[PDB]
Amino acid sequence: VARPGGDTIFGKIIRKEIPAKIIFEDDRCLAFHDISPQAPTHFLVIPKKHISQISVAEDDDESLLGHLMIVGKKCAADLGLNKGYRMVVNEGSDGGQSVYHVHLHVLGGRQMHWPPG
């Protein structure tokens, strides 16, 4: 109970223990810029609830997961991404996941290519 939300880097960002460049915050989620951007704009939307990866999300996490996408789309509009953007979730080893706290990437400000990696 000392630190709700765990000790991943993202858990610590939630608790203001590690700095981040915050775009939006509510009771359910946090949006902040990615430190290693892959596009001119590249941010993350994460739940405040710690979930390691999708593949272990519960059925009752549906509205939270959907909220990540709604917040991502609103933040994209607030950031002027008027030509569009790509949303990405990386699951596990083959997805390239590196932080085991669920997160949605939002990338834009350039033409995104196909395939998506």
Add this chain to the structure above:
Amino acid sequence: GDTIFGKIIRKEIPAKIIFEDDRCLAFHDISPQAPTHFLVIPKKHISQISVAEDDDESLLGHLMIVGKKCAADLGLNKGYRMVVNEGSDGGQSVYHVHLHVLGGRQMHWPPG
């Protein structure tokens, strides 16, 4: 503003269907970019994520839960990538919201 995905939902043209419920459909992509590449789409015609309404939030999450379950059923134990494209910079190919699920290979970075 119907699309080819509307015709797939209505069963007017064929697709390799993986899962269906009262509110979404999952089917293999006709132009797969990975050994497994499928789509999860809502039955509701939401043209693109940028116009989704805040009442659609749980439906959008349902696409991801269905995607996770279908990935497990298709043997993607090593992981996968989920993608939603918006507009021209996002490379959105059909103006009906859709979640891509790709796996069965290493996915690379950047994601396009």
